[PDB]
Amino acid sequence: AALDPRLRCTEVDGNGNVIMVDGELKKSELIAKYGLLPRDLRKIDSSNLPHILVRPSAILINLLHLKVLIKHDRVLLFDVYGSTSSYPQSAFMYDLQGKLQQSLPYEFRALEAVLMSVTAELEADFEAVRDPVIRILSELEDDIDREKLRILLVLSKRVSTFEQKAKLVRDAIEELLEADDDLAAMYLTEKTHDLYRGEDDHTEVELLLESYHKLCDEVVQEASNLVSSIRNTEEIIRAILDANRNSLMLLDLKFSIGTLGLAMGTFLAGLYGMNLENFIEETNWGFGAITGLSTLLSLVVCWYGLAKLRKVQRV
């Protein structure tokens, strides 16, 4: 059900005064008042794709956290029913009030305020995302551990998500900039006085949009650079781990060779430890002779094992 969702709205009139505070307005009343279309509101209500639409009496903006309807006399900010106003929305409202209470027309000032708020939020989000990755990379320079690699991958996923979001916002602004008739139709005050700019006269809007398109492009480039650096660090860590595993295997082989070398001498001592006739008992040289022979044979076995271990891994 729920045919009418009773959206939450706030409005500002021509002089910048708060003509209406946070209230509940139906969709039908909003459509009747602003003369909109259901398709435009349905496009706005999607919270995945930003949109900047122009209509012969309105400008519709659905950016990251702003749902704004700008007319030549009124500005409306709306949201879903039951939602509470956040700090960025209050800051945007205060900035819009300050700019409107103070040459540029009304709609251009509103658009400037919206773009300034969006760029500030983008920069703050980028810094908040970027700082822990720098801290982790600083900590990883001393020792290499698998948990740190897992944390690095977890942070890299968030960096990629933010890069995608910033790229989407920049592409929306670029697609608005590429159109020519929309920039001509963005003049509302001259439209009220029956003046048409034409398709060859749009100077202020192009500069105003470019001045923030550049700011978005810088953030996108920086995010891409951070992603590349993270990937390189991960590759280096993996190579180091593989080398460590190979060294451990070689050490185990050397320990096995040593064990065999001791076992041979233990066997020889056991042979002369029997309860039989050795024929060299009660002689002074027997003990030293057998000890030297056993030690020499153990050393020879160890040397042969080490030599063949060196010869095998020569390739």
Add this chain to the structure above:
Amino acid sequence: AALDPRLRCTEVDGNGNVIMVDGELKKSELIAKYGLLPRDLRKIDSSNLPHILVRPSAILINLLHLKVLIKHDRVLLFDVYGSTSSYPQSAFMYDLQGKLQQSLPYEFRALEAVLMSVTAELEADFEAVRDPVIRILSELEDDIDREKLRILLVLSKRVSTFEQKAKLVRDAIEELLEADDDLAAMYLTEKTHDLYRGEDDHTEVELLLESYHKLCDEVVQEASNLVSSIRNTEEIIRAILDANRNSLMLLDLKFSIGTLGLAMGTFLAGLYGMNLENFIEETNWGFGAITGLSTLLSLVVCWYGLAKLRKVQRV
């Protein structure tokens, strides 16, 4: 062969009474009665893609479990020969009878009933799919086992399948909503009275379709979130298993070092266990001296092995 498949049909007249109960009607008789086309029925008979088609005297619906033909006076629900009516179909029939026996026209009420049944079935299927995954993830928080990972992957496949099905249904409704002439052609009662709405007057149908498009979109988003969480859990489990394997290898190396350390002292005891002249027999200090020397050499070998094991894996 089988030129005529003799489809099973049920019909409801204008007053909502059951004018005909479950029966067998040929394809040719159905085409002659309803004035359809073979291509539309062939498109409907496919059980892989949902379809909402409009014709100048009919509305054709092939959703998840409904094959419905809506006219301005009659409603027909049909299925393949030999099939038995299920509980959702009986519930839909009862709901349609209750809504029609009771302002909105006939076809809009039928469409509302169909959409309500489809959304209810989608929500029930989503809950039934979602519950075992939550139970498995709750059980996996204590211990990690490979069989639980296999069960998690098996359930994730079903979640992905349901997400694809819900996405297909939502895309069908969205594609119907985007068209403009179809919404104008959806008025049948006014068409009987020779009244044409035009391409600029369609208000009721747009709201009615949006009110269920939103409900489908919510389910699609929730399924995507569940899939992402499952993937993250699988990655964490794999990392834990790799760390466990490395720890086991290190323990094996330490055991080898201990074995060598004991073997050296065993060799020394075997050297002094021979049946020869030791020159220190019948002396009080010999036993303690040899015992201390063997223990000291074993400890030295163990310490050197542990030190080199620590030094190797420093990188």
Add this chain to the structure above:
Amino acid sequence: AALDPRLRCTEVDGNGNVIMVDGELKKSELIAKYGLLPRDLRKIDSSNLPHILVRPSAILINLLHLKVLIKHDRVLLFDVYGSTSSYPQSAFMYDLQGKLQQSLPYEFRALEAVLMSVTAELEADFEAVRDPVIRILSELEDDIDREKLRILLVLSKRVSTFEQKAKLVRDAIEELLEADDDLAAMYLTEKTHDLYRGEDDHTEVELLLESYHKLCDEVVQEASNLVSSIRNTEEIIRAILDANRNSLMLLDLKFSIGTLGLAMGTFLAGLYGMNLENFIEETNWGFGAITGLSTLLSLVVCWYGLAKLRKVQRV
């Protein structure tokens, strides 16, 4: 070279009698007799893509094993030079003779015979492919072996190939069905009598083609289901093998712990086996005391090793 390939041909006249038996006809003579075009024959001669083409005096069919030219009076089946007639071709010829010697026109009966032969061959090939996979899956339920997995993959490749072939045949029939003017141009007997059906009158051909399109679709669906089941079985087998490898590694570690535990007691016995003064000789309690001490120390070492092995793999 080889400008003229001298294709092998067989022909049947209007009354169904064999007017000509297996013979050698040049390409130029065939083109002059049937009034064809080089492009159509070049399209037919490709043995990778099936084709159903319609021309104002002919129907051209290049299916799996049939190269058929159907006219309003004659039917020709042709093949490459030097080829021998197989059993399916002879069966198709006998069936066509029986159907033509016996309301439906000539070309529709020929098309029915061709489609029946193709569907029968498809079903026979599917059964022959499907049976060994079922046998292998039945044998694999008792024990898991790598050779059986290799055989399963080898059979799965053939199942995928047959699925692709059946999908290609079904897509050809569907693409023929979607066209509208071709179905109007498929009437040759009425074309001889200067009667044109038009673009709104084609009933018999649509039903006739749908009745075999459904039969192809069923086989495609069954092949896809078999492929999915094979993939699931392969995944289960791989998981079982990995678990077996981990269990073997754990058993090896336990054997190493046991070896160390015995080695410690062997060292202690070797210490008291020396030819020196033990100070407890000729006493009754010495043997039992040393035996108990060595056994106790071996058990303590084994218990400590097992406890640390349990503690390491807790994660």
Add this chain to the structure above:
Amino acid sequence: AALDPRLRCTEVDGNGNVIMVDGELKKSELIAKYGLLPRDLRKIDSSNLPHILVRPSAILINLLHLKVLIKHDRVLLFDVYGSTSSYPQSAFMYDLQGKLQQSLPYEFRALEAVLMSVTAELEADFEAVRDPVIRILSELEDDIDREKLRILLVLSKRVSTFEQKAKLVRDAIEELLEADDDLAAMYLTEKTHDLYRGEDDHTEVELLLESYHKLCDEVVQEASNLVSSIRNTEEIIRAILDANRNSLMLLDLKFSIGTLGLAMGTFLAGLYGMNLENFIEETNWGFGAITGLSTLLSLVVCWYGLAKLRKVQRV
């Protein structure tokens, strides 16, 4: 720099005599003499894509090793400056001279010679590529070795490269065949006499091009079959290697069990080898009793280890 590259050229007049031998001609002189365009010569000079272009007074061919300009009276073969004539180019020149010195027009004979040379070179290259792979596969049937697998992969890369080259040549001929106005414009002798063939009269060119398109298609199919066979052999070899590794691991485990079984009996003998009171000295049955007990315990330990090894890997 190098505005004019001074291409190397050879020419043949209408009677087939060598009117000019290998010489250096500028690009501007060639363009002025033949009335060409810079774009066509730039397309020809690329050595990666074959091209068959038709112009109202010329035919331009850039195949594998031929850069040929055919007119109704002259034939020119050109190449880069400083290059030397190879054996295939000399053979093509001799064949062209023999065919022209001898019904078919001039340009069709030149095209026939070019296509014959290209097909002969393709077949020779295919045989030269194919032979070593067959030799390696014959040698690999006795024993499996990693170096042979590396050689097989190295040869498979070359087979894939040749398959791609042959596919490119066949696609060029097919794209020339599909065009209709080009085949009409390929008649130059009739164009000199002011006779136009039209878009419905082209018989000789189609057969002439098809007779070599088939020859290219055969080679492409054979190369694809060889690639598939190589891939299957590689998969079989990898499976065999994995089975060998598993068998080696099992053998190592059995050796460890045997070592433990001997160690237990060595410990028991060491216990009775001490210099204490055994209480069974100077008795006849003691030696046999202890020997039998130690052997029995060693056999019991070995049997238990083998039984648990069998029980672990049952899954």
Add this chain to the structure above:
Amino acid sequence: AALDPRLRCTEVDGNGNVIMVDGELKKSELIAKYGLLPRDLRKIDSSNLPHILVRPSAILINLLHLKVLIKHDRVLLFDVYGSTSSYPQSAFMYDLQGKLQQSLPYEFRALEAVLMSVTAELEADFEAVRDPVIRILSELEDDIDREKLRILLVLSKRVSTFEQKAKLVRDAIEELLEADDDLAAMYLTEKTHDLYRGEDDHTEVELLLESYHKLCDEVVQEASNLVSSIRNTEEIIRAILDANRNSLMLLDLKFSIGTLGLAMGTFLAGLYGMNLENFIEETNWGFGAITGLSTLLSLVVCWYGLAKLRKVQRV
């Protein structure tokens, strides 16, 4: 903010004298002076895609390191605010001054200078990239090490990046060459005198652009060849490492067999080392008999182990 960025500019007049040295000019002043459009300057200011644009009174070039505006009387080189002139830019300025102070028009000479500078920079960058890879590949011919493989991959990434950059530059020149009306519009001096070349008269520009397109294509081909060689070397190194690992495993197995072979003889010596009645004491043959028996049994165990090791890995 920053509506006007105050770009850094340098200018050269018709006679080639430096009419203005490095200065700061606003975007609005540049647009008013040169009669440009905001879209063209926005396209130029992107530093990722090279561009060669033609306008009825200007030529706009944004290559690797040059931002050049060429008119029929003036040449301007510009860059961002705060940047310092580099050595390639100074060399390009000196070369342009030397060429202009000295038949070809003004704009063609400027374009020749720009293309010469770009090709020289491309060749220098290619040589600087190529040399360390050759040095590393020369050093790797003696011994194989993982660090050298890591360095090889690191250098291969840079080679791929340079190949992509050169491919982008070559594609820009090719796309400029393919256009026909742009080459006609590239004549500015004739445009001042009201002479139009037409779409069929452009000879000088085509040759001038081709003479550098070839130079770019050569560098792209050489970079691709280097990348392929690097990949082949990496594959060979990986195969060698795998063979080394297998050889190490076989050596470990042989060491285990030797350890067991010695352990058996040690057990037999321990059996005859006990303090019981051997019944062969005070006999001459006992010592030699037991020594020979123990050595023979150890050799038999070693031989059996080696034989079964050979038999296992036969497949």
